[PDB]
């Protein structure tokens, strides 16, 4: 009596579950045949216009220190770095200990090395030219006698092939199908709480995979009041991600003209060393307009003193250790950079223009968690400049307690992983099922978004939304990205690239759960009607979920998304009752 | 009308041989966070919940099961899965090095040092090492030139084994992609090819424990209540017959000495592991076995020898020389290989009238193996610190009939060695892959309980039971199929390994196209469920002319397509055109 | 007669030109399976013998020769097939060392050599007995008796795995379901023209995936006279080709007995060179009768006249360079040939404006070949012991223009070589690929026994083409398992080494592009609501602004291929505006259903 069971195929309630993302690009504005080691010649053309609807009443917590998109792309970029390294040739025989003298200049930085090597198998020997500097050469047995690479005693070094470019491209991570992506718009979300002003979106936004440490550049601005985030403070063994509103923009350059000379080793082997030099050489200085840097720190200390009992807070430079960890390591214009940040944190303040960062460049790049493999870049000819907006910092607080009640800050840096978190804090993946379970007691203006929040009604419009979200679940051209008819004719690409793993992965996923819904409904009730009541039977013998309809007319689908996790037996027993009700009727017309 | 009103039928135990590829199935019992230190398996990534299967006991039927398709798939899979491990593993780059080998205190021919005089790959320095070595690993000249070198150097390259990985088996379960079935013969008293009397079916296999075994069958499965040997060609002396055992035979083996481990640096990412040093006692590894049980057991087996095949005399000569592997008994346990001179087992001779202490065997260890069908593949193992004690159940013996003259001695059964192919044949001896076409056609005379159910009777309603079979296919949540809940999540992050999931996605993508491939005919015929889909076609008796009785109760439906469903294919087209010329007349004229 | 509802159609046999991944077919694997080594170079699925090819001699649209699709896509295929077989083979790396060579005497083509070789660990051989041809060495100096490998600047070091042979297998390309291959039963129109008699074909006829220079082997024939294929600025300067009307054939010789000596190199590697020669050597030579050459070559003049009025002709020899297209290039016997055509084109024809009836060819062979489109990696070819006799048919040649004015009333046709692309671009000329858009839109009709195949109603009778739609479904885009799953489950699963060849990854790509289409078309049929039927009518008045045509022109004699280009402009309109009008009655339908 009263049936108490309906599937309600039109219900927008989610499951907090990871999946595999879907990759995308926007190379339709560029189409450069140089392949841009991230972009790898144009993933898929982006959408012309994405859509969002604010979902005002949902207030879900998002621990951004538990987001799987952090770790999932963490393997992806390394693998993208791993793949595009692989075909290009490696410096295996070039590991010989070498003599090396400095250049005529400063302070004896640049060093011209000479060395024997049997490059070819044609038995070659010659004192070959090689130009370096003191950041890649370790000395052996004395400061002045012997010289060798700081790596290749242990690691593996490889010359990346010069054709591809180190220019980060604004991409879109995007979800394949069915399951979607959430967005936190209200400000001051420190990363451990709930958030408000929440909308959803299919592809994220223009994400830029930048890699430099000790600062954050070309990231977002969040043009409001300043906010700073960290997983923890009292656990002082954590780190602080700083975010900044005011777009500080810093220009940097290489102060000299350079050429490209190659060492022709053997088959397919043309080692590109530092060719030559014309002019004088500087330390590639960076000027900041310090009055902004004098300014914006005073913004920070106000929004930090409050979090630690209006108490003394100061800045000290970081300690010793590793060049990737304490030095401002930097990459723009393709070529890498190190910069001494001591002129920025010599600043201890407690409440009442031009600059020179003597910078360095770095060629061979080790891993960040291993000792195994190391990547090498060729020198780029001529001069180069780079100017970019800088937004947000990376800071830690030292754990030792002093006898003043003050806090020493030393700048964080040394991880790939949390660098991407700053672009991901607004976002959360969620898994979508249109499935539902809700008893019926009743008779037996457009929202594009995937939520309507008024779960007190099933039926005023809460049925009508996923009707429109079913229109997502089938799409060909410009609705669904993958089933776009033009690119499928275009895509005769091999799958051995990380693309062809990730590309069809989404497509085989998209089809199967589309059929997975389709089978599981079709054996149990066809979707010709959205509400499945052929007097499908009542459940109050073991459901017993004590409620009446008018309090279901004032509720959310909150308990409704946690009835049949305790009682999924109810879901299964309607299947056999579907099986039991059909096994008597059809064979009755048979015999 | 008694005119043949054709009608489709969805749900019928239609069989055919097929050659498909399968998924794995196991438990998180011995998981312990090793899908990488385990073996090739990756701990068998998907999950077997529960062997909820139902067998069938209706009919006897010919199957000739010794000619199957699982066996050669397993030959490709495991060797590939062996390749999967060693591909990130390093390569021994100095191979045919000088190796000044000697050892102090002359048991002789024991473990020796060999003193590398090598150059590293990075620098240009020449250095000296110590390295412990068995006798079975080197090849000298003249016994005093110290010309010992690694045996498989001139064959091919030799790798190390990425020493963090173990070597135990795990009982796995081959599960077919659904829409299929797996058949098995368990009516007792049965051997090899020919018919059986049991139509018992399963969805997944039992716990195959795939150890690559030598001469004896090692903790696989025991036989039935009676010792039986499987059916082969008893002529031709080249079928290498194998007999199972009713009882189990138990043997434990152990190296008495304990050993340490060193690490020798070679080059970039090349720290090579060898035996460090030995503590005190240097006794050889032996293997003891109660001969009184062994004296008993062979008495049983020669009874089944003479009576089933030539009852006169039998001489167990040992196998003669040749292969270093086929002669001795190369046992694996503890993640460790060792060979065994089993000559102290077959010095027996048997007759009928004149018939009716725990022997120990000296075994010995080799550090190098080789591919058996190929010269191109060779492997190491890391020396395991300390001591290893592990036992084993013996489950069967591999036999070879020889001889050209017999009046002196009628039977020469030398202990047969393996091919590596037959070890699966020892365990896949009763299985067969069967595709199902659930659709089928037969006349109607009206126009317009287990997993297979009755292979003999009529279908009152048992087709409907075949539908829940046919629609579990991509449930996604329902736990019998593969449950697709942890089964999705275990692979969706790590499909990038591409050794086992490439089966699984191909298992996926085959399952869906057999779904739609069965749907497309249903979609075109407009049946779309309803399980019977009556039409109105008067069909000629050009094919079958029998009365309404015997077509309908006296005969079955597996035989039905064999007996007169012949050069048809056009019967499909006849019901195809009928519906279109119906609906066009129904819609744009009526 | 003015209800004028639109009607959905599924299976109107239309097509558009597209690009698609390919899919093999070779049922000769079931015929002969000698070894799995040519099959390692050429692994393929077996299909149904006796397919159904249906002739539709009404539609005669233009066939884009010289811009055709498949010439591109298979070209990059075969390089990867050659790359796939080469990668696990060894790389003869340290043999770039200089080679002290002496002359074997009993010309001076073949030469014995000796050099230093460092092995695996430690052994040094003084005089390795290495035997070499003339045309694989370079003098470091002219008076120097030391010689070096020619292309050893780059990766010459690859040598083939010697258990593998190199013999062509009749292969057939297939597109997956939803697609079709076309073929021109019109008798030898031109290069680039619309031809009348055409047909459908699922998978093409036998192809020998071979390579040749100024020559074509085992191709097709002309049922008519000799025909040619060309284009516009070919008449300015670009290579044209030759298709002879009937096959002439040569039988081309071997030297003698050969011996396959192995040379130890290192750990997992062993180089193979010619050990020993039994007897004295005759050069390899081909036999061909000049009378067969004489009779056909005047027909070439008849064709050069059927083009350039009746002007006379001179065949000077090809060029003064390019050692790869100055001679011939065969692969039979697992061996690469070169034959000087100097003795062949001592020809010039009559001004119409006999000794030794058979002719021999002084020929040579090289052990080392090299790719051309990129300077780089190169293959060594192993010696073949025994006898290397060979014979094949000649069916075609390739020719240049030689633009210019010298005598002002003559022309030179020095024979054309070419790239690798032309050899297929020759014999793929009848063939082109289309897709199917089986969804159809045409307005309603006012009124409320012979076999055809794939496109059997698409030729003509377009109102009557509305009958029999499902033959355009059942096997054509339905029946995914037709040759994609039917007979391949064993043998192309039986030992595919490393499980991912170039064919299977296409085949993986093949099966999904079927169902992505098939679900995706069903997706729209999901959205369109009229699903579970074949045709259906919605409730929207077709405005005459789309087509003010009289209804008899539609349902009797106007082609669906030009019907669609008339509706083409308003396609994105109807697709949107009718499903929302469907959604307009649907949002009232739940208002009728729920409320
Ligand atoms: C964070 O984001 C910021 C913001 O995007 C990045 O900073 C940008 O970095 C990009 C590249 O990294 C800069 O674009 C490059 O600028 C080069 C310098 O151009 C200036 O000088 C030239 C000559 O004096 C002027 O003509 C330029 O004026 C033009 O560009 C400006 C800026 O858009 C326009 O406003 C003007 O109207 C002009 O259109 C600039 O004043 C520039 O050389 C370079 O262009 C070459 O490279 C591109 C591909 O990169 C080629 O397609 C193109 O053909 C050029 O190639 C020629 O020159 C090179 C030079 O070596 C030769 O090698 C070639 O052979 C060929 O001759 C490109 O436009 C951009 O200016 C800069 N902007 C700012 C505000 O910083 C940061 O890099 C980024 N960092 C991180 C960590 O994310
Ligand atoms: C255009 O198309 C046509 C057809 O469409 C092509 O014609 C083909 O041309 C090739 C090349 O000539 C032929 O294949 C090769 O033939 C070689 C000659 O074989 C004959 O001589 C040898 C030596 O005396 C005999 O042994 C042969 O007889 C044996 O084989 C035939 C046929 O199988 C049987 O009937 C006999 O009973 C014998 O069994 C012939 O008389 C031949 O040497 C060569 O063969 C080997 O390679 C395969 C693996 O690839 C081995 O399995 C096989 O056993 C042979 O291997 C031996 O020889 C090699 C040589 O080095 C050694 O390395 C091995 O270790 C082993 O000792 C191959 O068969 C082909 O027959 C012919 N087909 C037709 C229909 O004419 C044109 O080539 C083609 N042209 C172009 C440009 O594409
Ligand atoms: C141009 O298209 C037309 C169709 O529009 C096409 O016509 C077909 O031509 C062939 C060849 O003349 C005909 O086929 C013959 O049919 C008879 C039976 O009626 C068979 O006996 C013949 O078989 C013999 O000859 C075959 C070789 O042609 C042998 O293979 C065979 O073993 C037998 O010896 C043969 O099949 C066919 O009937 C006509 N079709 C019609 C409609 O008339 C013509 O082929 C097309 N031309 C091009 C170049 O494709
Ligand atoms: C190929 O296409 C042609 C035309 O595209 C088809 O021929 C046409 O067939 C129709 C139907 O048979 C003919 O209409 C009838 O013609 C007869 C003869 O005059 C007449 O008596 C009838 O009253 C009716 O009008 C039509 O005339 C004819 N036209 C032409 C140009 O042939 C042909 O059937 C198609 N065949 C194949 C194999 O594709
Ligand atoms: C310039 O370099 C040369 C050669 O190394 C050296 O002898 C000389 O002292 C240098 N001079 C200056 C001004 O640095």
TrEMBL record, chain A:
Which molecular function term from Gene Ontology is one that the record holds? identical protein binding
Which parts of this chain are annotated as the region Fusion peptide? 445-460
Disulfide bond is among the record's keywords: yes
Question: Which cysteines share a disulfide bond?
Answer: 23-43, 88-161, 95-152, 100-113, 174-203, 184-195, 252-286, 332-386, 339-359, 526-532
Chain positions covered by the region annotation CD4-binding loop = 318-328
Q: List glycan-bearing residues.
A: 57, 104, 116, 143, 190, 197, 218, 232, 251, 257, 287, 294, 310, 316, 340, 346, 351, 389, 544, 553, 565
* Membrane-crossing residue ranges in chain numbering: 445-463
For the region Immunosuppression, give the residue spans: 502-520
One Gene Ontology BP term is: positive regulation of receptor clustering
**Any coiled-coil ranges, and where?**
561-591
Note the superkingdom of the native organism: Viruses
Q: Which residues form the Human immunodeficiency virus 1 envelope glycoprotein Gp120 domain?
A: 3-444
Per UniProt, what is the membrane topology?
A: Peripheral membrane protein; Single-pass type I membrane protein
What keywords sit in the KW lines? Apoptosis, Clathrin-mediated endocytosis of virus by host, Cleavage on pair of basic residues, Coiled coil, Disulfide bond, Fusion of virus membrane with host endosomal membrane, Fusion of virus membrane with host membrane, Glycoprotein, Host cell membrane, Host endosome, Host membrane, Host-virus interaction, Lipoprotein, Membrane, Palmitate, Signal, Transmembrane, Transmembrane helix, Viral attachment to host cell, Viral envelope protein, Viral immunoevasion, Viral penetration into host cytoplasm, Virion, Virus endocytosis by host, Virus entry into host cell
Which residues lie within the region annotated V5? 402-412
Q: Where is this region: V2?
A: 113-152
**Record-level GO cellular component terms:** host cell endosome membrane; host cell plasma membrane; membrane; viral envelope; virion membrane
Q: Report the residue ranges that make up the Retroviral envelope protein GP41-like domain in this protein.
A: 458-591
Q: What further note is attached to this protein's record?
A: Inhibitors targeting HIV-1 viral envelope proteins are used as antiretroviral drugs. Attachment of virions to the cell surface via non-specific interactions and CD4 binding can be blocked by inhibitors that include cyanovirin-N, cyclotriazadisulfonamide analogs, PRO 2000, TNX 355 and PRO 542. In addition, BMS 806 can block CD4-induced conformational changes. Env interactions with the coreceptor molecules can be targeted by CCR5 antagonists including SCH-D, maraviroc (UK 427857) and aplaviroc (GW 873140), and the CXCR4 antagonist AMD 070.
Concerning its family, UniProt says: Belongs to the HIV-1 env protein family.
Q: What's the domain remark here?
A: The 17 amino acids long immunosuppressive region is present in many retroviral envelope proteins. Synthetic peptides derived from this relatively conserved sequence inhibit immune function in vitro and in vivo. The membrane proximal external region (MPER) present in gp41 is a tryptophan-rich region recognized by the antibodies 2F5, Z13, and 4E10. MPER seems to play a role in fusion.
State the function annotated in the UniProt record: Surface protein gp120: Attaches the virus to the host lymphoid cell by binding to the primary receptor CD4. This interaction induces a structural rearrangement creating a high affinity binding site for a chemokine coreceptor like CXCR4 and/or CCR5. Acts as a ligand for CD209/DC-SIGN and CLEC4M/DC-SIGNR, which are respectively found on dendritic cells (DCs), and on endothelial cells of liver sinusoids and lymph node sinuses. These interactions allow capture of viral particles at mucosal surfaces by these cells and subsequent transmission to permissive cells. Transmembrane protein gp41: Acts as a class I viral fusion protein. Under the current model, the protein has at least 3 conformational states: pre-fusion native state, pre-hairpin intermediate state, and post-fusion hairpin state. During fusion of viral and target intracellular membranes, the coiled coil regions (heptad repeats) assume a trimer-of-hairpins structure, positioning the fusion peptide in close proximity to the C-terminal region of the ectodomain. The formation of this structure appears to drive apposition and subsequent fusion of viral and target cell membranes.
State how it assembles.
The mature envelope protein (Env) consists of a homotrimer of non-covalently associated gp120-gp41 heterodimers. The resulting complex protrudes from the virus surface as a spike. There seems to be as few as 10 spikes on the average virion. Interacts with host CD4, CCR5 and CXCR4. Gp120 also interacts with the C-type lectins CD209/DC-SIGN and CLEC4M/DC-SIGNR (collectively referred to as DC-SIGN(R)). Gp120 and gp41 interact with GalCer.
Q: What name does this protein carry?
A: Envelope glycoprotein gp160
Encoding gene per record:
env
Say which residues of the entire protein are included here: 31 to 654 of 847
């Amino acid at each position: 009596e009263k049936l108490w069971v309906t599937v309600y195929y039109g219900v927008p309630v989610w499951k907090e579950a990871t999946t595999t993302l879907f990759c995308a690009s926007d190379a339709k504005a560029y189409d450069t045949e140089v392949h841009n080691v991230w972009a790898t010649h144009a993933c898929v053309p982006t959408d012309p216009n994405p859509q969002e609807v604010v979902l005002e009443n949902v207030t879900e917590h998002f621990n951004m220190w538990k987001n799987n998109m952090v770790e999932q792309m963490q393997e992806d970029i390394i693998s993208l770095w791993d793949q595009s390294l692989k075909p290009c040739v490696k410096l295996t025989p070039l590991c010989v200990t070498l003599n090396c003298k400095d250049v005529n200049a400063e302070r004896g930085e640049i060093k011209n090395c000479s060395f024997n090597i049997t490059t070819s198998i044609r038995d070659e020997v010659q004192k070959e030219y090689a130009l370096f500097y003191k950041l890649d050469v370790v000395p052996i047995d004395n400061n002045n006698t012997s010289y060798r690479l700081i790596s290749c005693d242990t690691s593996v070094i490889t010359q990346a092939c010069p054709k591809i470019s180190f220019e980060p491209i604004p991409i879109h991570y995007c979800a394949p199908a069915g399951f979607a992506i959430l967005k936190c718009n209200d400000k001051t979300f420190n990363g451990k709480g709930p958030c408000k002003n929440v909308s959803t979106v299919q592809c994220t936004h223009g994400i830029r995979p930048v890699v430099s440490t000790q600062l954050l550049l070309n990231g977002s601005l969040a043009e409001e009041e300043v906010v700073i985030r960290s997983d923890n403070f009292t656990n002082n063994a954590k780190t602080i991600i700083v975010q900044l509103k005011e777009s500080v923009e810093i220009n940097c350059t290489r102060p000299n003209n350079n050429t490209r000379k190659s060492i022709h080793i053997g088959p397919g082997r043309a080692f590109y060393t530092t060719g030559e030099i014309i002019g004088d050489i500087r330390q590639a200085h960076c000027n900041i307009s310090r009055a902004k840097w004098n300014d914006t720190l005073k913004q920070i200390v106000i929004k930090l003193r409050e979090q630690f009992e209006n108490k003394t807070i100061v800045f000290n430079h970081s300690s010793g250790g590793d060049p990737e960890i304490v030095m401002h390591s930097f990459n723009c214009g393709g070529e890498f950079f190190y910069c001494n940040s001591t002129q920025l944190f010599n600043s201890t303040w407690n409440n009442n223009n031009t600059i020179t960062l003597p910078c360095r460049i770095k060629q061979i790049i080790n891993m960040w968690q291993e000792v195994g493999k190391a990547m090498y870049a060729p020198p780029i000819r001529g001069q180069i400049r780079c100017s970019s907006n800088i937004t947000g910092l990376l800071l830690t607080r030292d754990g030792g307690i002093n006898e003043n009640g003050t806090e020493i800050f030393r700048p964080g840096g040394g991880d790939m992983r949390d660098n991407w978190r700053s672009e991901l804090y607004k976002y959360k993946v969620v898994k979508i099922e249109p499935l539902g379970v809700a008893p019926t007691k009743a008779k037996r203006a457009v929202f594009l978004g995937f939520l309507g929040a008024a779960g007190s009604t099933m039926g005023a419009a809460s049925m009508t939304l996923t009707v429109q979200a079913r229109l997502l679940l089938s799409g060909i051209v410009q609705q669904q990205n993958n089933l776009l008819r033009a690119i499928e004719a275009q895509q005769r690409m091999l799958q051995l690239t990380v693309w062809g793993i990730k590309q069809l992965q989404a497509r085989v996923l998209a089809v199967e759960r589309y059929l997975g819904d389709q089978q599981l409904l079709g054996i149990w009730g066809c979707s010709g009607k959205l509400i499945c009541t052929t007097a499908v039977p009542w459940n109050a013998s073991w459901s017993n979920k004590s409620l009446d309809r008018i309090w279901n007319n004032m509720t959310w689908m909150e308990w409704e998304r946690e009835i049949d996790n305790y009682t999924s037996e109810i879901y299964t027993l309607i299947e056999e009752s579907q099986n039991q009700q059909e096994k008597n009727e059809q064979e009755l017309l048979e015999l």
